Every structure is written in C-alpha cells, then in structure tokens.
Design an enzyme around this catalytic site. Structure first.
Site, mmCIF file in Angstrom:
data_model
loop_
_atom_site.group_PDB
_atom_site.id
_atom_site.type_symbol
_atom_site.label_atom_id
_atom_site.label_comp_id
_atom_site.label_asym_id
_atom_site.label_seq_id
_atom_site.Cartn_x
_atom_site.Cartn_y
_atom_site.Cartn_z
ATOM 1 N N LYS A 44 45.046 71.065 28.202
ATOM 2 C CA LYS A 44 43.798 70.336 28.016
ATOM 3 C C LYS A 44 43.888 69.490 26.741
ATOM 4 O O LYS A 44 42.879 69.010 26.227
ATOM 5 C CB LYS A 44 42.613 71.310 27.913
ATOM 6 C CG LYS A 44 42.328 72.102 29.195
ATOM 7 C CD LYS A 44 40.996 72.864 29.148
ATOM 8 C CE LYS A 44 40.959 73.919 28.048
ATOM 9 N NZ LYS A 44 39.746 74.811 28.145
ATOM 10 N N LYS A 46 44.640 70.446 23.726
ATOM 11 C CA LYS A 46 43.917 71.136 22.675
ATOM 12 C C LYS A 46 44.658 72.372 22.169
ATOM 13 O O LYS A 46 45.420 73.006 22.899
ATOM 14 C CB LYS A 46 42.529 71.544 23.181
ATOM 15 C CG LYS A 46 41.611 70.367 23.472
ATOM 16 C CD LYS A 46 40.436 70.762 24.353
ATOM 17 C CE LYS A 46 39.537 71.789 23.695
ATOM 18 N NZ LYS A 46 38.339 72.089 24.537
#
Ligand SMILES: Nc1ccn([C@@H]2O[C@H](COP(=O)(O)OP(=O)(O)OC[C@@H](O)CO)[C@@H](O)[C@H]2O)c(=O)n1
Ligand SMILES: Nc1ccn([C@@H]2O[C@H](COP(=O)(O)OP(=O)(O)OC[C@@H](O)CO)[C@@H](O)[C@H]2O)c(=O)n1
Lengths: 126, 126
Positions: A44, A46
């Site tokens: 993602k 992240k």
C-alpha cells in the site's frame, strides 16, 4: 447476530481511528477487524511505525473491537466474509467505490473520514 | 469492591501504556484513570501532541478502563482516593518511592515499566 468487518493498518492510533471503529461496531452487534501485516502495508506504499504484533495488541483492547485477524493480501476478502459470516463490510470513504464488488455478498458501507487528523499530519508536525 | 486508581498523561497511546493498564486492572475489580490536563502536563515540563479531549476519548475505550477523570494538580490525590473509595494506588516503577506518602491512606504498588518504548522514542524516531 449482525456481524461487521473492517480492514486497515491502524498505526499510531488516533481519534479518527477510534471514531471509525465506533460507528462500524454500531452498524451491527459484533466487529471483526483485519489488521494489515507489515508485508501487505508495503503493498500500500506505506511503512508502519508500530509492528504488526504491537498494533494488534493495542487494537484488541478497544471496546468496539470483538476480534482481530491478519490482513495478508487483497484476495482474502471474499473468503473472509464466508468464514466469519459477515453481514456488513465497512471502510472510510477514501475507499469509496473500490469494494462495491462485495455488494452481492453483504452490505457495503463507506463512512466519511474524520476531518482534521491523519498519520501524515502527525509525523509532519512531530 | 476493590477499587484501583492510576495517574498519567498517556500521549500517543502505545503498547507500553496498554500493559500498564492491563496489570493495573489485574489488581482490583474496577480501575479509575486520572489523565493529566494539558495545564498539568506543563507542570511536569511536558507538552502532549494529543489534547486532553482526544487523549481521554481513546483512553476511555480501553477495556481495562472503567472511568476517567482529569488530573489537574499534585494535591488532589488525597481527596480523589476519598471521593472514589480507592483501595489501591498504582504507578509504573519509574515513580517508585515517590508516592509512599499515600500508604497511610491506601495500598501503594509500583509495576515494572515496559522497557523499549516511550513517547519520546516515538517522537525522536519519527
Ligand atoms: N482521519 C481518519 C483517518 C482514517 N480513517 C479510517 O481509518 C481506517 C483505516 O486506517 P488506515 O490505517 O489508513 O488503513 P488503510 O490503509 O485505509 O487500509 C487499506 C486496506 O487494508 C483496505 O483493504 C480507514 O477505514 C480510514 O477511512 C478515518 O475515518 N478518518
Ligand atoms: N514503557 C512504559 C511507559 C510508561 N509506563 C507507565 O505509563 C504510566 C503513565 O504514562 P505517562 O504518560 O508517562 O504519565 P506520567 O508523566 O508518568 O504521570 C505523571 C503524574 O501524573 C503522576 O502523578 C506510568 O505509570 C508509567 O510508568 C510504563 O509502564 N511503561
């Protein structure tokens, strides 16, 4: 029983996360949360400051949450709904429309995010 | 009913705080948490990233926590313990010995801190 489920990383726990879980639980009478592993969080774009073990530890204590399972990949969702007899699927509205393909299996609800707070604002000001 | 009370700021709630609250509740039947106001935090030469309002909101959702009140000053302990009929006062051992003056009123206990995590570490690493 009306079972609800929601997915997310929930790193650096804040009042916006609290408000999401609060409304989610109150959409039914039981809430399951699939927390992203560090491998998936990366998919993602992240990186979680807190580890999966610790992020799960904290979330399991919040009253609104009945049980926690790991979120390992995008494809696991349909089976999750079957395995946990889920009736409602919920996410914050920054995912509006992305999971409409689950409507033929359960109710899908997008909750307006809590304005004024984010993990990015926290790190930035910190 | 065996009532327990504990005091603290609890900013950027992490797993170390959670283990403190878990073991605090293990000591009695009910746990009162007195959270430092932003005003009192200043007296401890500190400033929380999260306001009292928000620190109380999240804290209130932790299952180990039955009730929350504000910690406004150093002197309110005596009266608090009387008002809430507290039987056990507990703090992390970084406060060991500092509250023994309360022994003439209630049972005082210190729990070993969770090494490896702190509000300062999170801020410095971010
Ligand atoms: N101010 C904020 C911040 C977040 N959220 C909600 O918090 C939940 C999850 O937070 P994230 O840690 O950002 O997890 P996310 O990356 O959105 O999960 C993505 C994926 O797991 C979905 O399968 C989301 O529903 C999001 O909408 C919110 O309502 N308000
Ligand atoms: N790794 C950590 C970090 C904190 N704590 C415990 O967390 C509680 C409070 O956390 P703080 O936010 O640091 O509040 P504090 O400034 O210690 O309270 C001070 C004052 O209000 C007491 O009269 C304390 O009991 C502390 O020992 C812990 O056990 N382990």
């Amino acid at each position: 029983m009306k079972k609800v489920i929601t997915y997310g990383t929930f790193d650096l726990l804040h009042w916006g996360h609290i408000k999401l879980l609060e409304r989610a639980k109150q959409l039914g009478d039981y809430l399951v949360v699939a927390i992203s592993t560090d491998e998936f969080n990366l998919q993602k774009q992240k990186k979680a400051y807190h580890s999966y073990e610790h992020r799960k530890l904290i979330l399991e204590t919040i009253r609104y949450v009945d049980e926690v399972i790991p979120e390992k990949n995008w494809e696991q969702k349909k089976q999750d709904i079957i395995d946990h007899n889920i009736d409602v699927f919920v996410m914050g509205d920054d995912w509006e429309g992305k999971f409409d393909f689950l409507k033929d299996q359960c109710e899908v609800v997008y909750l307006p995010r809590t304005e004024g707070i984010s993990t990015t604002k926290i790190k930035e000001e910190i």
